Amino acid sequence: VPQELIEKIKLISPGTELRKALDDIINANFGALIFLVDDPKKYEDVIQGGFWLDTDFSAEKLYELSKMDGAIVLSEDITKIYYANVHLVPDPTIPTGETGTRHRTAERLAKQTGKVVIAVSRRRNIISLYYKNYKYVVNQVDFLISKVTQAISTLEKYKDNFNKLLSELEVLELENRVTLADVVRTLAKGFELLRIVEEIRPYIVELGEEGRLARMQLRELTEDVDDLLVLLIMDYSSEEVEEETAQNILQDFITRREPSPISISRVLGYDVQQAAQLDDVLVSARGYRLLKTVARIPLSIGYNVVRMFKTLDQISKASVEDLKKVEGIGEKRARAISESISSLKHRKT
Amino acid sequence: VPQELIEKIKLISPGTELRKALDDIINANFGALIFLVDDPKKYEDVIQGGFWLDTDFSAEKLYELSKMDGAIVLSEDITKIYYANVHLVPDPTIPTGETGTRHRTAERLAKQTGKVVIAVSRRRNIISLYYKNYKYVVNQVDFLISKVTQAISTLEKYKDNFNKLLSELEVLELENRVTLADVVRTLAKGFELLRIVEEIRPYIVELGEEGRLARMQLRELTEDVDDLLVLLIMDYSSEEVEEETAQNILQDFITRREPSPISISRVLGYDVQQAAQLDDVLVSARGYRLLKTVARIPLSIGYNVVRMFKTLDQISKASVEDLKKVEGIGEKRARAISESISSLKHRKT
Ligand SMILES: Nc1ncnc2c1ncn2[C@@H]1O[C@@H]2COP(=O)(O)O[C@H]3[C@@H](O)[C@H](n4cnc5c(N)ncnc54)O[C@@H]3COP(=O)(O)O[C@H]2[C@H]1O
């Protein structure tokens, strides 16, 4: 959805004065045809009759004016009401796939002028926004909340399964018994979880102010998921991979590519044919995930540790003395690494 | 009202199936916009979307189709329904003094194509017919009947005073005591009476089949008034005058010229400037009225009788033998003339 169009959508999103007025118009079953222009004098060819108002905008004024037949003309920033009860006359030759005089008029005028035109039928509760060659149907909050609440509840389920796969993989990592199947399975669920987030995003935006709690819920649920997926990619990719490259891997599986077993294993650098082979491939974590998230060791410094010990397994066997031989690790970071790992092994395994 | 428009108005007059449908539409508060054209193909630029029907017309079909939004397209003779639910798009630059999309659309389309377009709003009970640059509002029968009934009542009153004036003029005429004032007063009342008929005529025409009784009443009330007035003009005009000149005099006072005492006397060939003078001008009827109406003597032959005697007074002093000295008058005409005058003088004076 183009950004130039997303900007216009904000104009009638829950929270704005304009939307408050449109909600009331809908509740009263009045119809509405609103034309947003900047220079009223320049549309004497498409705007006919009505009353010249040139007054300050307000939700109550718009509502009251919508009681009359015809269209209302507002300024682009919704600060002035220019005309009311006007007859809009766009070029009849302009193609339109709309039905009815009001919507056909709205699409034609928007295409002809490159301006925003809002239409509301008397019987229905949707707001149709036309801008240039675009058409966006805005829904009432109740419909949006139902979809968003369902999506969140769905996300909770995926997240619960992600957490179980993660704790299981954690045990396998600490014991160095991880297979490519385990890794890919965890990444797959992580990619599916973030995809759901991406798909509900437009619903959230459209909710405007009414989407505050929904946003907070999405944040609490998916907080550090992205980072976690990036660290897993770095820890299990066939060959050393830069963080940015890992983040790009993530972005691709979250939008373009499809998170299938073989496909994920393929992008990780493993030449696998059948998904049954995944259980056959053994892999050892580099150690980034634990070093950063648990030992609180910056990636730039974690590279150094991996460069020397190569795997988490070796890192877990290294003494403080051993660890201090690494650039960037003093008695403090050496203790943190050593202690955080020995603590997890004892508690988890 | 041009004969051209008059023909179209008949299409929606009480009695037609079309009008029957429009009345139902009005009674149901549905709206309507109807475009009459014989070759739809040629107007495909002003007719958009909708449903192609091409079916035989019926009042029930038109009524049902009017439940949908948009416009209906019928053949000019109203025998076929071509489209329903269409969007009519006439040129926006066409000037119009109408209000609302529906009526502004109808006027522009009518001007643009030179055809008939019918508009009916849901809120009102009138039918607006637009043809070319003409606009005729058709009213419901109830409104028309009320106007027509009051006009008829008014005519009865004028006719009564007319008969009172005529009866008194009859006495004076027989006694040869007529003054210009007597004649003028009678003519003025007769002229005023016929003007009312002319003014109410359009209402009766617009009443269609529901105006049958009204036409009968008008005819019974004004049956022989025109002839009577023409004969009065011929009998009292300054100098001899033909039936054609008289008939023209009548038409002038019923439309163009105002029937004022001085104006009537002036047109009769009398030089007067004050109404008071009228009671000072003694006049004598030629005899045409009595010869034609009572003696049943053809005007052509009446000219001969007046040629010889000049006035009714002299005609009543003639004998059968004397009267027969006129060409066209035999013992029969002579008897009818002589006996009819003598009988009236005995009964009226
Ligand atoms: N060119 C045309 N072709 C076919 N039918 C025509 C027509 N123009 C008017 N009408 C018929 O008249 C109905 C009501 O017209 P109205 O102006 O009261 O009530 C209108 C008007 O206030 C508004 N509206 C529609 N088009 C407009 C325009 N171009 N400019 C300003 N207001 C418009 O939306 C209301 C409802 O529109 P809707 O079509 O549902 O309802 C229409 C339609 O069935």
GROMACS .gro file of C-alpha atoms and ligand atoms in nm, chain A residues 33 69-71 86-90 100-102 105, chain B residues 33 68-71 86-90 100-102 105, ligand 1:
model
   71
   33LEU     CA    1  -1.967   1.308  -0.043
   69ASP     CA    2  -2.820   1.675  -0.029
   70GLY     CA    3  -2.507   1.705  -0.240
   71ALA     CA    4  -2.142   1.737  -0.150
   86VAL     CA    5  -2.275   2.144  -0.402
   87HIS     CA    6  -2.321   1.943  -0.721
   88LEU     CA    7  -1.994   1.769  -0.825
   89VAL     CA    8  -1.952   1.727  -1.201
   90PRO     CA    9  -1.645   1.520  -1.298
  100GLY     CA   10  -2.434   0.439  -0.813
  101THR     CA   11  -2.409   0.813  -0.879
  102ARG     CA   12  -2.230   0.901  -0.553
  105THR     CA   13  -1.888   1.056  -0.903
  382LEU     CA   14  -3.583   0.983  -1.395
  417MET     CA   15  -3.411   0.072  -0.830
  418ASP     CA   16  -3.180   0.375  -0.822
  419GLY     CA   17  -3.079   0.544  -1.146
  420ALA     CA   18  -3.276   0.612  -1.462
  435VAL     CA   19  -2.871   0.353  -1.574
  436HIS     CA   20  -2.649   0.647  -1.493
  437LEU     CA   21  -2.739   0.940  -1.720
  438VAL     CA   22  -2.438   1.163  -1.791
  439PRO     CA   23  -2.526   1.478  -1.989
  449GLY     CA   24  -3.059   1.871  -0.715
  450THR     CA   25  -2.872   1.609  -0.921
  451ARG     CA   26  -3.190   1.453  -1.054
  454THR     CA   27  -2.950   1.599  -1.492
  699LIG     N1   28  -2.727   1.138  -1.351
  699LIG     C1   29  -2.815   1.052  -1.290
  699LIG     N2   30  -2.841   0.928  -1.343
  699LIG     C2   31  -2.928   0.841  -1.284
  699LIG     N3   32  -2.991   0.877  -1.171
  699LIG     C3   33  -2.971   0.998  -1.110
  699LIG     C4   34  -2.881   1.093  -1.169
  699LIG     N4   35  -2.880   1.203  -1.091
  699LIG     C5   36  -2.962   1.186  -0.991
  699LIG     N5   37  -3.021   1.060  -0.997
  699LIG     C6   38  -3.136   0.966  -0.908
  699LIG     O1   39  -3.184   1.050  -0.801
  699LIG     C7   40  -3.149   0.992  -0.677
  699LIG     C8   41  -3.136   1.099  -0.570
  699LIG     O2   42  -3.071   1.219  -0.605
  699LIG     P1   43  -3.018   1.313  -0.485
  699LIG     O3   44  -2.954   1.437  -0.540
  699LIG     O4   45  -3.137   1.350  -0.399
  699LIG     O5   46  -2.949   1.254  -0.370
  699LIG     C9   47  -2.815   1.221  -0.394
  699LIG    C10   48  -2.708   1.327  -0.375
  699LIG     O6   49  -2.735   1.407  -0.260
  699LIG    C11   50  -2.576   1.254  -0.359
  699LIG     N6   51  -2.502   1.274  -0.485
  699LIG    C12   52  -2.492   1.177  -0.586
  699LIG     N7   53  -2.421   1.221  -0.687
  699LIG    C13   54  -2.380   1.347  -0.659
  699LIG    C14   55  -2.302   1.448  -0.727
  699LIG     N8   56  -2.250   1.423  -0.852
  699LIG     N9   57  -2.281   1.568  -0.664
  699LIG    C15   58  -2.331   1.597  -0.540
  699LIG    N10   59  -2.405   1.505  -0.475
  699LIG    C16   60  -2.431   1.382  -0.529
  699LIG     O7   61  -2.609   1.124  -0.319
  699LIG    C17   62  -2.752   1.111  -0.309
  699LIG    C18   63  -2.791   0.974  -0.355
  699LIG     O8   64  -2.748   0.928  -0.479
  699LIG     P2   65  -2.826   0.807  -0.547
  699LIG     O9   66  -2.765   0.770  -0.680
  699LIG    O10   67  -2.823   0.690  -0.450
  699LIG    O11   68  -2.981   0.847  -0.583
  699LIG    C19   69  -3.022   0.917  -0.702
  699LIG    C20   70  -3.062   0.853  -0.835
  699LIG    O12   71  -3.143   0.735  -0.819
   0.00000   0.00000   0.00000
